[PDB]
mmCIF file of N, CA and C in Angstrom:
data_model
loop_
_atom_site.group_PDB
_atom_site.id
_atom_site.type_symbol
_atom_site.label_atom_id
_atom_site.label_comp_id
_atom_site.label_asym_id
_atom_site.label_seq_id
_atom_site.Cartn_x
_atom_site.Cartn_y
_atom_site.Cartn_z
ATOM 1 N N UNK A 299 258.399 50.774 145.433
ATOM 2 C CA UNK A 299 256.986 50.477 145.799
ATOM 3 C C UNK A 299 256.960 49.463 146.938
ATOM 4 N N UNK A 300 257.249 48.262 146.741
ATOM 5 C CA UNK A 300 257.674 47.314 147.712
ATOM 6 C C UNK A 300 258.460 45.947 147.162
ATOM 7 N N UNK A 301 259.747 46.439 146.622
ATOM 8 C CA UNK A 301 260.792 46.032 146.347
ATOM 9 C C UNK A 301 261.415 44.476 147.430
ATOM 10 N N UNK A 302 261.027 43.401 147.612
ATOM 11 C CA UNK A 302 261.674 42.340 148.453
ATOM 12 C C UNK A 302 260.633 41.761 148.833
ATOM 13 N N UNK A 303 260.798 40.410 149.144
ATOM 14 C CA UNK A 303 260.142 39.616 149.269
ATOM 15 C C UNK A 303 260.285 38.150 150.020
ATOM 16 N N UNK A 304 260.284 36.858 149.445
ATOM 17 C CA UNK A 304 260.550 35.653 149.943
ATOM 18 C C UNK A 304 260.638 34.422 149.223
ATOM 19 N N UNK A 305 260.066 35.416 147.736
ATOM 20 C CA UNK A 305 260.419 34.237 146.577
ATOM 21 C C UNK A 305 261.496 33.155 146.533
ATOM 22 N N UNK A 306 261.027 32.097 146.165
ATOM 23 C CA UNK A 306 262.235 30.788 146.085
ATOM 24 C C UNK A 306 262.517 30.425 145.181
ATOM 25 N N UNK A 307 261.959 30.755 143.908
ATOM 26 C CA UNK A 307 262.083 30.544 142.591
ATOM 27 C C UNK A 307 262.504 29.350 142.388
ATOM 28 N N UNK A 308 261.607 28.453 143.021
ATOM 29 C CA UNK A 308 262.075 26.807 143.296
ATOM 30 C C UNK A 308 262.374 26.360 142.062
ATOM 31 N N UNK A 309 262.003 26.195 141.084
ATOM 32 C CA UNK A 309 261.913 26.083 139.316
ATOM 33 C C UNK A 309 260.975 25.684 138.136
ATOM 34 N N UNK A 310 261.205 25.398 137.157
ATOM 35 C CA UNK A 310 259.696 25.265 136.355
ATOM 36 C C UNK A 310 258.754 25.368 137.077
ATOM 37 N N UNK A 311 258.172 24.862 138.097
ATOM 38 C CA UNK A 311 257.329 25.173 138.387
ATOM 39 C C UNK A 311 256.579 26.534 139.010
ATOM 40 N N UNK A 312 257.398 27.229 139.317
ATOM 41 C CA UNK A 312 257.586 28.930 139.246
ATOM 42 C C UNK A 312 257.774 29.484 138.344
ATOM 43 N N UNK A 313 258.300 29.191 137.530
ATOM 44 C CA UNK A 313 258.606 29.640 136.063
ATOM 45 C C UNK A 313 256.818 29.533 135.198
ATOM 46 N N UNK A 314 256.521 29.015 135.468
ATOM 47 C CA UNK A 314 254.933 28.591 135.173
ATOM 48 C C UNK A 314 253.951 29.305 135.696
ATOM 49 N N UNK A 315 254.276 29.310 137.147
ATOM 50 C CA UNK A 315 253.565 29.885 138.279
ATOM 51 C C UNK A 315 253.404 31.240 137.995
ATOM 52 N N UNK A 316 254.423 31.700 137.776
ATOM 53 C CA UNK A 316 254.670 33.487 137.942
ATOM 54 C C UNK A 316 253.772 33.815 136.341
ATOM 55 N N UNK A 317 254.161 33.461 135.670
ATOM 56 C CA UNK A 317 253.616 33.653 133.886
ATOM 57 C C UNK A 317 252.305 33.220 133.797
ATOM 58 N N UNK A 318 251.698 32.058 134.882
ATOM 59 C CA UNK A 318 250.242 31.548 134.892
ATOM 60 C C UNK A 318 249.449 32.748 135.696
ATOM 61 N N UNK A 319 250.080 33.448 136.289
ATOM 62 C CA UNK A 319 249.008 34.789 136.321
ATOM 63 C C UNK A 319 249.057 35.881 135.349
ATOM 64 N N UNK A 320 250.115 35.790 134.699
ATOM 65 C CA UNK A 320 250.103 36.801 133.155
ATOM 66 C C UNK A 320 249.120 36.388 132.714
ATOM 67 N N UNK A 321 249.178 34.915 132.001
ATOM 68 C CA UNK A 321 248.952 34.590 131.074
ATOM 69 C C UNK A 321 247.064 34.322 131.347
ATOM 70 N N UNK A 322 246.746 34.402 132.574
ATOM 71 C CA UNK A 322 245.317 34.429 133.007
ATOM 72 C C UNK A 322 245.157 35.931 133.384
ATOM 73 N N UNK A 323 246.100 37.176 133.000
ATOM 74 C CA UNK A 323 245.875 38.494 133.231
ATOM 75 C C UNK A 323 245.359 38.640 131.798
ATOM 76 N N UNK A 324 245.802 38.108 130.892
ATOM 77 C CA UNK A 324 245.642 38.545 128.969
ATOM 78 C C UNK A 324 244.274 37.941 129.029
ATOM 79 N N UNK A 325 243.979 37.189 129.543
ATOM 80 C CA UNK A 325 242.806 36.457 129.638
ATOM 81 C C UNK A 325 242.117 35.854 130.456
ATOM 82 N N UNK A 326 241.866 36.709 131.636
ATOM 83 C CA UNK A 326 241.446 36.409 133.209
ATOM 84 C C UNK A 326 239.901 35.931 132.694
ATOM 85 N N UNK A 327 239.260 34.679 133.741
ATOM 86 C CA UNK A 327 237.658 34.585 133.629
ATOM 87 C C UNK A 327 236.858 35.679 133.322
ATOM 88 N N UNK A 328 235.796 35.941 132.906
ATOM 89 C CA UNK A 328 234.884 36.530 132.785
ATOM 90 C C UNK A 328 234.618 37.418 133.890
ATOM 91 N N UNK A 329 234.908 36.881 135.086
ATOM 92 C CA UNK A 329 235.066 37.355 136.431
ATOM 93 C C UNK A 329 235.909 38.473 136.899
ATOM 94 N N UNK A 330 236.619 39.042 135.939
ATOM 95 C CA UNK A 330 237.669 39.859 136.242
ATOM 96 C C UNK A 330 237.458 41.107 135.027
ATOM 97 N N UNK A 331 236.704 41.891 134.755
ATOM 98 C CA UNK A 331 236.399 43.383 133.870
ATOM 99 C C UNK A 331 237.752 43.573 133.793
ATOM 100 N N UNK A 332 238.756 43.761 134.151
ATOM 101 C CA UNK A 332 239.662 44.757 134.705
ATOM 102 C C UNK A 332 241.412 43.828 134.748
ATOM 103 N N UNK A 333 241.496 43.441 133.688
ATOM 104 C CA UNK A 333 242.771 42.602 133.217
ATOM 105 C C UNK A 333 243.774 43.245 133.538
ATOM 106 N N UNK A 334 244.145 44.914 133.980
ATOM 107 C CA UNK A 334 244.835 45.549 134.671
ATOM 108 C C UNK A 334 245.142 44.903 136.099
ATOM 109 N N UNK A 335 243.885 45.065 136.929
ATOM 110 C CA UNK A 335 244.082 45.140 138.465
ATOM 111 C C UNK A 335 244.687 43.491 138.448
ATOM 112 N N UNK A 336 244.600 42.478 138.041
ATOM 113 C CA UNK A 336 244.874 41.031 138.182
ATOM 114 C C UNK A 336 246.448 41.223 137.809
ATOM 115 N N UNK A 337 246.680 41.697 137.180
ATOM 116 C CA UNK A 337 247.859 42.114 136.782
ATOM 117 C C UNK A 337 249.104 42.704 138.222
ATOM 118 N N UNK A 338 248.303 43.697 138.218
ATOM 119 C CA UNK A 338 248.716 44.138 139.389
ATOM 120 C C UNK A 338 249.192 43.459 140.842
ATOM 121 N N UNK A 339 248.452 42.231 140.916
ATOM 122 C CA UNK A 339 249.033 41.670 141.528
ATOM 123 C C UNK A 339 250.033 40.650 140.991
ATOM 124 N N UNK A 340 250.698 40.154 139.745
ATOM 125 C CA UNK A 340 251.613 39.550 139.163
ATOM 126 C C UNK A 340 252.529 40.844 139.590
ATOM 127 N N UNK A 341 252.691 41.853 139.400
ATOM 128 C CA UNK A 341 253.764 42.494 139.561
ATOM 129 C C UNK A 341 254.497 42.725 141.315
ATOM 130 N N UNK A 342 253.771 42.079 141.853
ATOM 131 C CA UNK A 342 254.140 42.046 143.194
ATOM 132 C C UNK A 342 255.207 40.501 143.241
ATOM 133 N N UNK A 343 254.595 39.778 142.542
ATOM 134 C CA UNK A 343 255.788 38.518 142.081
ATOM 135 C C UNK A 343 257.227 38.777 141.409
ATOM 136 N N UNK A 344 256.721 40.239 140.571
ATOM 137 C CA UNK A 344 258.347 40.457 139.513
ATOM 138 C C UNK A 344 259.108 41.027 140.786
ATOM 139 N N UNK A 345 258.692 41.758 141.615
ATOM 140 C CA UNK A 345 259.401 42.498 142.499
ATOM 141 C C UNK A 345 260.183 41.393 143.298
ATOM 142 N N UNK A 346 259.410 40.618 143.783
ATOM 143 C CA UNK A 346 259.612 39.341 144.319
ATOM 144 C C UNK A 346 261.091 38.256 143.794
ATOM 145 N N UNK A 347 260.859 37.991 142.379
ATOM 146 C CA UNK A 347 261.730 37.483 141.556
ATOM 147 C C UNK A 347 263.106 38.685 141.676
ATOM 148 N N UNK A 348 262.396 39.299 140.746
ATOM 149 C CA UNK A 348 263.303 40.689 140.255
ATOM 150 C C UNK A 348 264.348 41.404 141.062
ATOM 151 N N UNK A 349 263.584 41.326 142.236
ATOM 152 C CA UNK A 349 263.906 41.869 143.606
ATOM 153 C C UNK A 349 264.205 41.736 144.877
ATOM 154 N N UNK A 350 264.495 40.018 144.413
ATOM 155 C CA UNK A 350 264.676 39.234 146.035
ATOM 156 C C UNK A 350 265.162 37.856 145.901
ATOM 157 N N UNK A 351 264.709 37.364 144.388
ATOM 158 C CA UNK A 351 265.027 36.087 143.632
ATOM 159 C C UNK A 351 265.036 36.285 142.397
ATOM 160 N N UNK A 352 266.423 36.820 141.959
ATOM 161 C CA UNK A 352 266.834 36.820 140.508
ATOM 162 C C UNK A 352 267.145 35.735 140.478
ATOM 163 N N UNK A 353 268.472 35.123 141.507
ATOM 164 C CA UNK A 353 268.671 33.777 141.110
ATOM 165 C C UNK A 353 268.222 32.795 140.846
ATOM 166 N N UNK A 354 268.664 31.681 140.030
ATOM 167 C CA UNK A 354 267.986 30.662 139.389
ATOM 168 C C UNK A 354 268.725 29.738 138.993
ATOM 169 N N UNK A 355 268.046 29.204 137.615
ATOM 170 C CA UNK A 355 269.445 28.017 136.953
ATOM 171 C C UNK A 355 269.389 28.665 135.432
ATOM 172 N N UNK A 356 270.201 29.949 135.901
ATOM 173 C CA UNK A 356 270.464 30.516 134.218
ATOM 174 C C UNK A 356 271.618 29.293 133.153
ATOM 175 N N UNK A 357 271.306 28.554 132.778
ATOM 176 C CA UNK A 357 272.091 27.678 132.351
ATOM 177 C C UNK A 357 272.911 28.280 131.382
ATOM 178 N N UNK A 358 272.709 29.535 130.482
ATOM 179 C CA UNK A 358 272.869 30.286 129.591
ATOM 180 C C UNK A 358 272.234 30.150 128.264
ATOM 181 N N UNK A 359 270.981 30.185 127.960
ATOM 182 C CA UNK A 359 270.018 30.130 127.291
ATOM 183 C C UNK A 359 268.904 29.496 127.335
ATOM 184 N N UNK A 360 268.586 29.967 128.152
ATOM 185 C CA UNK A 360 267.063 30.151 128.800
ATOM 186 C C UNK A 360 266.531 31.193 127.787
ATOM 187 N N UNK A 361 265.439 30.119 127.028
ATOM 188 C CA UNK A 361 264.537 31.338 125.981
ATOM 189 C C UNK A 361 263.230 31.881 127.262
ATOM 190 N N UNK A 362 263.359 30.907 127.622
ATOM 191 C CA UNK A 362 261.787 31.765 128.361
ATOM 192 C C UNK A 362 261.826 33.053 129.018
ATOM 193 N N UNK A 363 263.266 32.640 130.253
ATOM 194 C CA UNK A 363 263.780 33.400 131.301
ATOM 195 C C UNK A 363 263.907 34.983 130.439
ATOM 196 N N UNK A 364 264.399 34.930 129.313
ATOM 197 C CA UNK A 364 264.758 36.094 128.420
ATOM 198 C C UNK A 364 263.013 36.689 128.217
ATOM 199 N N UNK A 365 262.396 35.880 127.766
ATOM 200 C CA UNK A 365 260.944 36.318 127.625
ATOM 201 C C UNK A 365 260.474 37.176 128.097
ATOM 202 N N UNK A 366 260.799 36.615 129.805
ATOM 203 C CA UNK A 366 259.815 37.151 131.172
ATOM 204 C C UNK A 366 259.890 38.497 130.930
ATOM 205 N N UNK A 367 261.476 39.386 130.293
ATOM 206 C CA UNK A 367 261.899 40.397 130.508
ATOM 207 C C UNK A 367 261.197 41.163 129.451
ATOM 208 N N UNK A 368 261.129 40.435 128.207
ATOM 209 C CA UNK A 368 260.913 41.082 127.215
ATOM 210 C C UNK A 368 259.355 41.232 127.625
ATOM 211 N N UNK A 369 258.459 40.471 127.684
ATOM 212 C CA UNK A 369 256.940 40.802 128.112
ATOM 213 C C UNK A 369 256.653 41.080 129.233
ATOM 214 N N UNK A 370 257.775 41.526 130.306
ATOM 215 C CA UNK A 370 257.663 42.308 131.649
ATOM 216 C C UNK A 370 257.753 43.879 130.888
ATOM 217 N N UNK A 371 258.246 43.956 130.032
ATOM 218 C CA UNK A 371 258.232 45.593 129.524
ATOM 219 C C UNK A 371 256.895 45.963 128.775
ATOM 220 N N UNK A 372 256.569 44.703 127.760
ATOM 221 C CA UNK A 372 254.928 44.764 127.614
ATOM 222 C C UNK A 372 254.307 44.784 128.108
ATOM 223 N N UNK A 373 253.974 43.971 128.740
ATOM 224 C CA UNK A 373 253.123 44.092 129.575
ATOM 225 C C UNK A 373 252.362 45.196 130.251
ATOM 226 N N UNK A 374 253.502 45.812 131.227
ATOM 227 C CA UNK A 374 253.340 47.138 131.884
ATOM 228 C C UNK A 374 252.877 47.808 130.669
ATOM 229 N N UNK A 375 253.204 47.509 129.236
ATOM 230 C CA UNK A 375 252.846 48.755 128.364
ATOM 231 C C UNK A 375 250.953 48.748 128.253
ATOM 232 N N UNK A 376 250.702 47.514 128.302
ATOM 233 C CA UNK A 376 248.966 47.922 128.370
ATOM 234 C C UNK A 376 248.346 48.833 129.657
ATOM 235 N N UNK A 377 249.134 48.650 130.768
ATOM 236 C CA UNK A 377 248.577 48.943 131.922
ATOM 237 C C UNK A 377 248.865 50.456 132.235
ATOM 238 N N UNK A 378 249.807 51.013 130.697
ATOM 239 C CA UNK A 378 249.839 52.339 130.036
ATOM 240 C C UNK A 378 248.312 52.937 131.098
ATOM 241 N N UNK A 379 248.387 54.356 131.817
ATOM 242 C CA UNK A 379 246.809 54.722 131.485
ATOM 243 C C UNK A 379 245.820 53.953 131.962
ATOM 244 N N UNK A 380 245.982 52.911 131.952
ATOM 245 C CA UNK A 380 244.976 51.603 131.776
ATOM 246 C C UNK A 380 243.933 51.887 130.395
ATOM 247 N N UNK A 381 245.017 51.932 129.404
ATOM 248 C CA UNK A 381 244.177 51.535 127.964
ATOM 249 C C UNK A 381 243.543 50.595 128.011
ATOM 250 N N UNK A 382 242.236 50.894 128.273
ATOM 251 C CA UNK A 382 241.125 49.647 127.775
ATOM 252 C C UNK A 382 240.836 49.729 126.457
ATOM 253 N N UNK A 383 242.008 49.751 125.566
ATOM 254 C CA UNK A 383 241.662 49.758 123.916
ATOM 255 C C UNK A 383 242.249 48.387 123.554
ATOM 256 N N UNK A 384 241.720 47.645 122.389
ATOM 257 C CA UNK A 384 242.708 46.512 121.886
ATOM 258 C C UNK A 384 244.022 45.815 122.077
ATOM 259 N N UNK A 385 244.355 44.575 122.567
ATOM 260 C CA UNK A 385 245.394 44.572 123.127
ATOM 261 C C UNK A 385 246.765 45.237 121.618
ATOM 262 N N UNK A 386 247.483 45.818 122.155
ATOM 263 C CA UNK A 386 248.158 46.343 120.916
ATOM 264 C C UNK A 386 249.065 44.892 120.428
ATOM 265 N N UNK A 387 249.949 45.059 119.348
ATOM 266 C CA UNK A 387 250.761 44.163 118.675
ATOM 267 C C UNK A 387 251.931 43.995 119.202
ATOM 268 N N UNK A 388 252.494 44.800 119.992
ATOM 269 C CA UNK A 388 253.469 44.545 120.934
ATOM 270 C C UNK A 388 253.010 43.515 122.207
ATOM 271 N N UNK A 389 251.643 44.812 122.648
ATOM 272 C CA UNK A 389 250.840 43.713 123.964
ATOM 273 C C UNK A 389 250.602 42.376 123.531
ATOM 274 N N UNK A 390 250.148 42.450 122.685
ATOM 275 C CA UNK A 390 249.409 40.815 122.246
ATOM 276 C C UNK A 390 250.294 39.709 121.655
ATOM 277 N N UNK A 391 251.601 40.677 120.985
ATOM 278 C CA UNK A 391 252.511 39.987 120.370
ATOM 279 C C UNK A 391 253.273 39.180 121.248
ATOM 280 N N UNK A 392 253.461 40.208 122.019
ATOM 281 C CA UNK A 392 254.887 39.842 123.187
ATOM 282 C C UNK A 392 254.137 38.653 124.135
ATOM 283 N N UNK A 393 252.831 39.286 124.609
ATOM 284 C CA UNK A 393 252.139 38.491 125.214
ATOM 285 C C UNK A 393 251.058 36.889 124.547
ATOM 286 N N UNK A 394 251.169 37.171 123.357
ATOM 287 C CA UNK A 394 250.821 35.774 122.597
ATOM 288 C C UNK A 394 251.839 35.081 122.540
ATOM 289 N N UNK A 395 253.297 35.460 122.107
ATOM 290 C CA UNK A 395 254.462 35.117 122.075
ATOM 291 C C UNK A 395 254.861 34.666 122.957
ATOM 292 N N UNK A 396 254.551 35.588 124.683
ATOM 293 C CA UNK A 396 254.880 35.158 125.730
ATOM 294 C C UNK A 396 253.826 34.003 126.183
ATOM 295 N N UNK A 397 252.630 34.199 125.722
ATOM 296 C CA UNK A 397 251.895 33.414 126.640
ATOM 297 C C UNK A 397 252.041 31.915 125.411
ATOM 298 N N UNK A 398 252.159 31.960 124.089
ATOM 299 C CA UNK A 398 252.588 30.856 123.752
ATOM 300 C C UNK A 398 254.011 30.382 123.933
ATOM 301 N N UNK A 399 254.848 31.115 123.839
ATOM 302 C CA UNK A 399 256.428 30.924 124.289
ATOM 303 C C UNK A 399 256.294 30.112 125.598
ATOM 304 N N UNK A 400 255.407 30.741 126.530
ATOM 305 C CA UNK A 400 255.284 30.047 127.782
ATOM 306 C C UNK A 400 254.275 29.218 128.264
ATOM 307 N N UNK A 401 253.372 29.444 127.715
ATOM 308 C CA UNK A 401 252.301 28.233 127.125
ATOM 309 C C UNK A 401 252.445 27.183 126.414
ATOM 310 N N UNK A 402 252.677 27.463 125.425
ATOM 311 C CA UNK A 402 253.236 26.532 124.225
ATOM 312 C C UNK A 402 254.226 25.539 124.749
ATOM 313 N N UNK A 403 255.811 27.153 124.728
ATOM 314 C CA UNK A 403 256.932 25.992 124.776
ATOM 315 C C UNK A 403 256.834 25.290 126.358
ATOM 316 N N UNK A 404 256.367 25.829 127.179
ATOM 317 C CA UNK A 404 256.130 25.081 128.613
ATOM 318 C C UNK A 404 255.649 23.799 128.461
ATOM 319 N N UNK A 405 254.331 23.735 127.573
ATOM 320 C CA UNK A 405 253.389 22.804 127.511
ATOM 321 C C UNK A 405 253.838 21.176 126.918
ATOM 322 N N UNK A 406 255.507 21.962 126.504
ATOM 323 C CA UNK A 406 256.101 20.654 125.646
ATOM 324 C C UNK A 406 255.075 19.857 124.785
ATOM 325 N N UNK A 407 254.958 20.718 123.708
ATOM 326 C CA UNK A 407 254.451 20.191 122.890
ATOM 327 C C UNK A 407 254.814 19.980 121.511
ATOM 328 N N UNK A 408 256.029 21.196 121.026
ATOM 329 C CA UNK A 408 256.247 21.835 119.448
ATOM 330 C C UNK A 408 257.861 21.442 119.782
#
């Protein structure tokens, strides 16, 4: 699609960055009908990461970094069709999980 980019994946704070448009895709303002299309542009970031800046500071257990992957596969799964039905238990799971995994554990709080 358009595979490369210029990402720097400078750190946490990209790590934040990239997931703070997920995590405002599961739950964009009022302003946004269409939690798909917002989306759509986060996936121009995975390509980015995914596709131009994998590298990072895999220290070797990175729970989040593992996350991204696991709710990069969810994710795309709502945007199935564009099911505008309930977020499913995978979607919501992965993505409550993710967005508290990355909310939460980001937020250093637990």
């Amino acid at each position: 699609c358009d595979s490369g980019t210029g990402l720097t994946g400078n750190y946490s704070q990209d790590t934040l960055t990239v997931i703070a448009t997920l995590r405002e895709a599961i739950d964009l303002p009022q302003d946004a009908p269409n939690r798909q299309e917002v989306q759509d542009t986060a996936r121009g970031q995975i390509n980015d990461y995914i596709s131009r800046y994998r590298r990072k500071g895999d220290a070797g257990g990175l729970k989040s970094f593992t996350t991204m992957q696991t709710a990069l596969n969810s994710l795309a799964g709502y945007y199935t069709s564009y099911g505008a039905r309930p977020i499913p238990e995978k979607l919501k799971k992965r993505l409550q999980l993710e967005f508290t995994q990355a909310e939460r554990s980001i937020e250093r709080g637990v």
